[PDB]
Subunit: 501 residues, 3 copies
């Protein structure tokens, strides 16, 4: 037994149960255990039972046994023989610890898994040898399917910047081996004696949100804020669904090359604005409660209430008849309340609304709640953006896309009587353009003058021009798109020449 | 004789004179005759003499003889021998019928023709064998030159959707074999016992309009409404000239694939509007009389007076000095009369006008006479379109093409005193913008204020912007055109790869 | 001696000293001398000493000796032998004439030169044989480096349109062999007995301005009026620096193919306007004096004072903080004075200004001093152009390039209080829009109303639209540029096919 232990070749781990060889070969080992433990406990409590564990690359089966010691089933895998023998023997020493173990190569043992066979897999300082053998492209799929078959995988990756030969083969950033998955958070990081460049400790999943505290599953997930949002935020923002919750996860740091100052800073700013607003807000609304908020080294995480109903942008996208009025009424009521307080929401656009059987329209993305000044992103000085939004709301007119979306400002196309409402607001001087005014005008809009008549001169002229402008922008988009497509195809051909040479 | 008749191989036709073999082999034969007869009679009366006839593919010379029986010269052609022998004999039975006949292959007998040798050619159930032998591309030229050498050709084409082997070679639409010619109308159609898919009966010409009643020659013809109109109407609209008449011919149905609902419907709507207007119109104009109107299954035909003078668009296109004023005066006078009645013409554009030695401008295309509402196609609410038109009229400024033509709205560039006229109209509220007002202002425009002075602010600003806008549209057109050209060239290259593979 | 002279083969020149062979072989020779002399004298006086001379291709050393006779050092070069022998002997006849001479081929004798070894080189009827041997591409460099190593080169070129065989090899325009250099002026031209097509006489330099009278060196030189001016003037306009002077040189005639009527005429018009203005101008400014003005057959030359300080466009281009106000004050003061006189400057744009420690802004390019009417090139009726210019002045906003530069018209973005100044001007009717008004408003602008408040309606709307417009133009520029680049690359490929065939 003792003899078989030394027969062992390179004691990477601590042998579990006796401390006599802790002095000889090793790495720290015991700390990593502590964090994994924390994670296990939190996870298990959250679903409501003990868990199945996969110690992919276990060596001396240290981690397995230490987990099995707390009511866990482990099937530890280390392809080389001696490491397994001794750890299976270590398994027998403490009979109550349900751990199986076997010799075999991880790649194929992963292949042979089930959608929910295991709840947890461990990949501590193991894959860097695999990727050296196979390649980045290969390994990525293993891990991706590993997240799919389990429910949460924790890994410790060796970075390319290490002395050992294999280093050169692995990716400059170990984060490249995980990105393909849904959730990933930096739960830890450890320094190596090899070089002053430490190896990180990541946490993944393809079914659940795995925060410090909030460990709940999601239904669907993505990478963009809304339908037709694009690349606007450099693939950095992540959005997770949930039956009763919704999650935001912005990264402050990205693989390879980077979110420039402004982007990183702004999504940092955005979150910190949101959390500081949602906790301690004004009076007179039905705003969602903070379900979970928190920050990490490179990553900033937020979770809130999955408030009811669904988005307008997608409604208009289809055409589900929405009562034009009701949404506006509620929005204005709250909006007024806000204008009163001294706050403001700059992005008054149709991608920020909710609808139910009462159509009580409430906003989303409270990171746009700008306190001090009106401004928006485009139509300067709010009220105009609101006009656009109103045109965007009514709509039923072609499909205009000007980068700086979309519909005409001004009511004249708007049917009667809103037509009139807005012309009345319009007449007035800009200094009086506060939302308090609008709502009031909004309310007694039925008694307002004919609008469409008092126009003539200018005001007709510009209607004709506003329609011309969107068509122009609208086309520029398409020919610009043709141009961008060729820019993309031209890169390929430049590369191709080198391949052909 | 009788013996030679049966010696004959396959009695496709009825032998002419005796009814004894009408029972044996056949196709109906006698009906087709009746329609051809009608057509001959109408044609002959219209020019004022009997006619030369070409029975291309005659078989038993039935049709020839039946035509020769009414004072016609026929040179019937059937390449195979037996069919000719018997029909020449049938020719001799009735000596007074001037018909020659000979054995030879149609293709070469067509080649040997003269510009006005024949007045009529018959191609009843014959070419489908030719196109099987040669091909669609080939046959098209035969027919095209056949229309050129004669004066009217009637054909009966076998459609590709027929059981017989040759079917597969012919075009899915038999209308593809004729389109290259000037005039074509569906004069009939016949069902075949082969399959429940009938073979049509078309009527062509490259010199004359061949209506039911109106059978008059034209000088020149085309496919587009005006110089620089484009593909806007899917090659469906045809326009025929004439020394004293003008013709319109819109198709409700096209070869291969199709005028979508809107296009078919709109050109149907356009005609039906025109005929319903020109007959029973308002008071106070010099409008043209209906020379001929009528409808067919797939085709809608209209003919009216070739009213005098010539178009303005082409005048401006060159530069023939037109008295700026006179045209406007008359146009307004009638226009006013119309506004008064309750009617309206929406397309107040320079492609719709006439000019003589008195410049009494009158419109064209009475399918744009929209009764109820002002609107136009672009510059909304007429009066503005009129402004554009006035700028379009004066002009002498570069060459602006914005899709939504072209010139600035507003008079400020317009020289004095119209400058003033329009600023005065402009000042006024839009609700008062009726043509009745304009004419009156038009008349006393000499006594109007300085216009160009009272501007300042806005009104200058927008002048500068209006000039910018056309330049922008104007360029977008060209780079858009470059883009469309590459889209066209790219298709070719995609195809090319398949050819090269 | 006399015997050696006839031993000579072809007496192209006159033998210097005796007139006995002037009758036999020759070309005129003596006239060319007279012009070269003039040039030498003027040059020498201007630097303040006698000069070193290179008689590249000298034949009978006539010109050399004639120059050496006036205190010049000559190293005459004629590759063929006999011509040198006799001219070295002619050199010895008049011992006081410092001339060396040697046999060798010009190309290599040029190679062996120094930056300031010689002050003058002569290339009279010599290179056409070289270019026949080598080629246009080759010869151009010889001459280019010849201008660099000397300080002024005069040449007489044989044009391609000559009977002699070599003609076919030389360029259709002999001006093609010089253009690469900095300065070139047509100082003369001579008819040849060969054909009624004369050979010209050009004067070059790469260090100095070589006018009739003004023979001063420059520091730097170019081809475009300012940073980012482009090809706008067909490579015809040349601009020469100087420690105390500045030079303009516009060509009325260009190599190959040509400055069309308008371009030639306009740069002729531009100069003649300038000289007629700068001499006999209005009162109330600090305008520069004419240092030298004059005209030539194909070339129009002007030189004026290098007035102090530097350009604004390049200041803004970098960002050297300029006192927003001071420049405006002075400009307006003079501008007012001008408006008063009855004159005007149409191109009120930031590429036409100067700055010092007092920022007393004064204009440049007095060829834009249009007397009678306001107009500019774009923003019609001056005052608006001034608005643009003011926006262009303040700036600090992105980088807008609309062809018709650039910034918004109108003050509303302009900070306070100019904001107000311009709204006040704006309010007023256009007929009152003279600069006299503006300055006065400019002065008491501190006491003006709030501007930014009284807006509302329209005036806000158009602010939003003005920003949209520049972005649109701004993009059109880039995609237009992509398009133009492909137009350029496509030409190459069309050519390539012919090369590949
Ligand atoms: C360095 S250890 C770390 C073990 C454990 N994850 C830890 O951190 O305590 C990695 C172990 O996995 C094994 N291993 C490496 N590549 C493997 C593969 N493709 N399949 C199975 N085991 C592998 C090695 O034998 C080695 O003992
Ligand atoms: C089916 S028939 C119809 C005859 C006649 N057009 C009618 O409908 O009563 C066609 C006849 O034209 C002849 N034919 C076919 N191809 C021909 C060609 N290329 N040249 C001359 N005759 C041809 C055939 O022999 C056949 O008898
Ligand atoms: C026609 S002459 C003119 C001489 C002198 N430039 C003049 O105009 O009085 C040109 C002379 O230069 C010589 N020459 C031609 N090509 C030359 C070369 N590549 N190098 C040196 N000398 C050359 C010829 O021998 C000839 O005598």
């Amino acid at each position: 037994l003792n003899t078989l232990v030394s027969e062992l070749p390179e004691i990477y781990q601590t042998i579990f149960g006796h401390p006599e060889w802790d002095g000889d070969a090793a790495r720290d080992c015991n700390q990593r255990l502590d964090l994994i433990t924390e994670q296990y406990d939190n996870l298990s409590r959250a679903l409501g039972r003990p868990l199945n564990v996969l110690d992919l690359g276990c060596a001396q089966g240290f981690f397995s046994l230490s987990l099995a010691s707390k009511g866990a089933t482990i099937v530890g895998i280390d392809f080389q023989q001696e490491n397994i023998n001794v750890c299976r023997a270590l398994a027998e020493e403490n009979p109550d610890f349900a751990a199986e173990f076997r010799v075999g190569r991880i790649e194929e043992v992963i292949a042979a898994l089930e959608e929910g066979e295991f709840d947890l897999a461990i990949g501590l300082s193991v894959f860097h040898h695999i990727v050296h053998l196979h390649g980045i492209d290969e390994v990525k799929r293993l891990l991706s399917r590993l997240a799919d078959v389990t429910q949460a995988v924790i890994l410790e990756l060796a970075v390319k910047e290490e002395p050992l030969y294999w280093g050169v083969s692995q990716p400059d950033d170990p984060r490249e081996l995980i990105e393909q998955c849904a959730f990933y958070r930096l739960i830890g990081e450890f320094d190596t004696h090899l070089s002053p460049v430490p190896r990180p400790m990541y946490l993944v999943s393809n079914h659940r949100v795995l925060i410090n505290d909030f460990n709940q599953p999601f239904q669907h997930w993505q990478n963009q804020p809304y339908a037709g949002a694009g690349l606007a935020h450099k693939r950095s923002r992540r959005y997770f669904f949930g039956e009763d919750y919704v999650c935001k996860f912005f990264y402050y740091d990205m693989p390879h090359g980077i979110l420039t100052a402004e982007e990183s800073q702004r999504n940092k700013h955005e979150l910190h604005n949101e959390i500081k607003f949602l906790t301690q807000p004004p009076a007179g609304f039905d705003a969602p409660a903070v379900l979970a908020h928190g920050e990490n080294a490179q990553s900033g995480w937020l979770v809130m209430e999955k408030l009811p109903g669904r988005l307008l942008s997608d409604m208009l996208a289809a055409g589900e008849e929405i009562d034009r009025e009701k949404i506006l009424g509620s929005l204005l009521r709250s909006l007024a309340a806000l204008e009163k307080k001294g706050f403001w929401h700059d992005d008054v656009r149709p991608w920020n609304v909710m609808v139910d059987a009462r159509q009580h329209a409430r906003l989303i993305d409270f990171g746009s709640i700008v306190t001090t000044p009106q401004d928006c992103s485009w139509p300067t000085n709010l009220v105009q953006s609101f006009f656009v939004f109103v045109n965007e709301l009514f709509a039923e007119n072609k499909s205009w896309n000007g980068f700086w979306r979309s519909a005409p400002v001004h009511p004249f196309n708007l049917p009667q009587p809103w037509s009139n409402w807005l012309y009345a607001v319009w007449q007035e001087p800009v200094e009086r353009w506060n939302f308090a005014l609008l709502l009031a005008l909004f309310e007694k809009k039925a008694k307002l003058p004919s609008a469409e008549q008092q126009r003539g001169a200018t005001e007709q002229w510009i209607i004709a021009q506003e329609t011309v402008l969107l068509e122009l922008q609208s086309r520029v988009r398409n020919e610009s798109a043709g141009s961008e497509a060729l820019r993309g195809q031209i890169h390929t051909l430049e590369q191709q020449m080198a391949q052909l040479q």
